[PDB]
Design a protein around this ligand. Structure first.
Ligand SMILES: *[C@@H]1O[C@H](CO)[C@@H](O[C@@H]2O[C@H](CO)[C@@H](O[C@@H]3O[C@H](CO[C@H]4O[C@H](CO)[C@@H](O)[C@H](O)[C@@H]4O)[C@@H](O)[C@H](O[C@H]4O[C@H](CO)[C@@H](O)[C@H](O)[C@@H]4O)[C@@H]3O)[C@H](O)[C@H]2NC(C)=O)[C@H](O)[C@H]1NC(C)=O
Ligand SMILES: *[C@@H]1O[C@H](CO)[C@@H](O[C@@H]2O[C@H](CO)[C@@H](O)[C@H](O)[C@H]2NC(C)=O)[C@H](O)[C@H]1NC(C)=O
Ligand SMILES: *[C@@H]1O[C@H](CO)[C@@H](O[C@@H]2O[C@H](CO)[C@@H](O)[C@H](O)[C@H]2NC(C)=O)[C@H](O)[C@H]1NC(C)=O
Ligand SMILES: *[C@@H]1O[C@H](CO)[C@@H](O)[C@H](O)[C@H]1NC(C)=O
Ligand SMILES: *[C@@H]1O[C@H](CO)[C@@H](O)[C@H](O)[C@H]1NC(C)=O
Ligand SMILES: *[C@@H]1O[C@H](CO)[C@@H](O)[C@H](O)[C@H]1NC(C)=O
Lengths: 473, 101
């Protein structure tokens, strides 16, 4: 009556600390055991194993090692080649299999003993498709990283069949992590609207290679597929005027939810990040927030089921588990406002296709919530008729315009004086009188800067390149 | 006691037998296509089905020998995007106009 043993299969690192998903699995069980309100008479016990995340025969050993030892649930080996092997074990023996990451589920896989707390890309691909219609785009440039990313965005690729989009699908390079040959082809083709399908470890890597090129301007709009845009250390891109947009399921508005994330930073003291990683220092990823929710959703199901005795099964002798079909129905019929918001399941598949996103975007202050997505509501983008707040902070009517010009009598001259100190004041003439009375009417500030070539404008035939002031424009 | 295992011929089942045949040493001869992930460090397998790194380049040669500009690629299941990813990336460099259904 005192133990309900859960099973865990996690990444084996060789020298570093515990993984982000494993430490959340530790922190979730220790929270429920201390706070005696939830499960007042049962105390949870964890049994974590280590695999290589690419060895489906090693992951099939650790699943049978936990079934012979006796567990009640197995919380995922978190990879597409390894989770398919453990799912068919958990479907056979009866024990539920709680997944916290996305997996390509084939159409004829007749499995029922699994749930997935990661949001389905049948809903996330419809949410990205609502942002390419709220922003009224016509040409997108969807960029992924591996070949599985076409399945994650197949409701976006099929969009020109019915809407007026024009897809140009590209791919990041496989071996290297230098996207300079990719981003140069995107600048040259005039592609200002990009949808990156990356992880947040590679999303910070592209933006340092998009800042080293001239692509972090006020023209470019970037929509990111990942749910960890909020973990980017966006200090240098903050004043550029770039239009970074993305989603967020991690409910960082509640006081109770934000208190748990602050306690998460007090458990990762010995973890110095890279200074050139481009990420923040103390935060919870959405890969570890779902594992914190995955322990709580199952703990709701053991609250409504007190006769639960953990049995010991054998893989070679195929015997189903006694309380398998009843305990699995209690997991799919659950509701829990965890760290990732409202949690409910598809009830036909076991997937998660009903959730609450928060559309975030990059402003001068940083990332701010500018919307809310909900599958049977569409985008509730606030955006409103107010829009920008009360007045213009640190009034942008300066924005000092670097008015280029050339000197020619009597349009632009040098002033004939003896005192030496000048700068945008040594000029006089006709155009300087004109520019001074356009700044009086429109209310801007101007800083005269002569062209350093001394030409007006010319189409150089042997080069196809401009020559003069229109080159500076 | 066997010497070779000639495939269970499905993407969810062949990945489980490949990691057994990689472990024990016995070769694993595959006769159908399978999505092989990039970080699968396996060596004891061969695949006699033609790769779609070559078949997708052969279909791309017939949409240029026939001089097309608008194709309407139709698949049946979500794995078929991986089988034709060298055809979907074609408007990035050529003058095709994909409409995927
Ligand atoms: C999980 O549970 C969900 C709901 O809880 C079940 O329904 C799936 O999810 C959505 C429901 O809205 C479906 O996606 C939508 O499909 C619409 C098509 O309508 C019908 O058309 C086919 C063809 O005849 C029918 O067979 C089928 O029953 C569909 O119901 C589209 O019109 C929708 O497009 C737009 O919808 C709204 C409109 O404002 C927007 O908010 C959207 O962003 C979008 O632009 C939308 O595509 C989904 O297709 C349903 N699944 C299935 C299989 O039909 C599911 O049963 C359940 N399982 C899964 C895997 O989702
Ligand atoms: C980048 O973000 C700013 C935020 O205000 C966008 O500014 C306005 O966007 C609306 C469309 O949603 C336009 O109708 C306004 O004219 C914009 N005001 C400006 C530019 O002063 C801006 O458009 C965004 N850049 C894009 C989408 O390329
Ligand atoms: C969409 O708009 C807001 C969120 O953007 C939703 O919430 C409403 O906000 C207004 C302004 O403070 C309140 O007066 C309402 O009481 C809020 N409604 C709630 C909390 O239910 C609003 O409901 C949404 N409208 C829809 C979905 O039609
Ligand atoms: C334990 O968690 C619940 C929420 O599930 C909360 O209401 C309660 O206050 C917590 N216990 C303590 C002692 O704070
Ligand atoms: C655990 O506690 C609840 C409430 O205190 C009680 O109703 C339940 O019967 C207890 N479980 C047992 C005794 O197994
Ligand atoms: C104009 O706005 C404020 C003055 O209110 C000033 O501090 C700011 O630097 C100016 N902006 C420019 C020059 O771009």
């Amino acid at each position: 009556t005192h133990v309900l043993r859960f099973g865990g299969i996690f990444e084996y690192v060789e020298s570093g600390p515990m993984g982000a998903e494993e430490l959340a699995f530790r922190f979730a069980v220790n929270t429920i055991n201390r706070n005696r309100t939830l499960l007042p008479n049962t105390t949870l016990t964890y049994d974590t194993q280590k695999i290589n995340l690419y060895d489906s025969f090693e992951a099939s050993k650790k699943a049978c090692d936990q079934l012979s030892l006796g567990v009640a649930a197995i919380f995922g080996p978190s990879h597409s080649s390894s989770a398919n092997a453990v799912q068919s074990i958990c479907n056979a023996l009866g024990v539920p299999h709680i997944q916290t990451r996305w997996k390509h589920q084939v159409s004829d896989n007749k499995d029922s003993f699994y749930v997935s707390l990661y949001p389905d890309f049948s809903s996330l691909s419809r949410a990205i498709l609502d942002l390419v219609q709220f922003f009224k785009w016509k040409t997108v440039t969807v960029v992924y990283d591996d070949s599985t990313g076409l399945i994650r965005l197949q409701e976006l690729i099929k969009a020109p069949s019915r809407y007026n989009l024009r897809l140009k699908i590209r791919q990041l390079p496989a071996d290297t992590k230098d996207a300079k040959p990719l981003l140069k082809e995107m600048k040259r083709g005039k592609e200002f609207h990009v949808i990156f399908d990356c992880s947040h470890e590679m999303a910070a890597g592209i933006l340092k290679q998009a800042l080293a090129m001239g692509m972090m301007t006020e023209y470019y709009h970037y929509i990111f597929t990942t749910l960890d845009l909020f973990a980017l250390d966006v200090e240098p891109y903050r004043y550029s005027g770039v239009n970074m947009t993305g989603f967020r399921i991690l409910n960082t508005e509640n006081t109770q939810v934000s208190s748990i994330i602050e306690k998460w930073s007090m458990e990762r003291l010995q973890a110095p990040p890279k200074p050139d990683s481009g990420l923040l220092d103390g935060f919870m990823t959405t890969d570890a927030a779902l594992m914190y929710d995955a322990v709580h959703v199952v703990s709701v199901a053991v609250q409504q089921f007190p006769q639960m005795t953990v049995s010991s099964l054998q893989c070679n002798r195929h015997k189903p588990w006694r309380f398998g079909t009843r305990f699995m129905s209690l997991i799919k019929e659950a509701h829990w406002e965890g760290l990732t918001g409202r949690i409910t399941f598809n009830k036909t598949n076991g997937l998660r296709t009903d959730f609450d996103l928060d559309v975030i975007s990059l402003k001068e202050e940083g990332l701010e919530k500018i919307g809310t997505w909900d599958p049977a509501s569409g985008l509730n983008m606030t955006e409103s008729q107010k829009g920008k707040p009360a007045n213009i902070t640190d009034s942008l009517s300066n924005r000092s315009l670097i008015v280029t010009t050339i000197l020619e009598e009597p349009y632009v001259l040098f002033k004939k004086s003896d005192k030496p100190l000048y700068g945008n004041d040594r000029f006089e003439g006709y155009c300087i009188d004109l520019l001074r009375e356009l700044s009086t009417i429109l209310g801007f500030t101007y800083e005269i800067r002569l062209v350093e070539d001394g030409k007006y404008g010319a189409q150089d035939d042997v080069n196809g390149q401009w020559n003069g002031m229109v080159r500076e424009l």
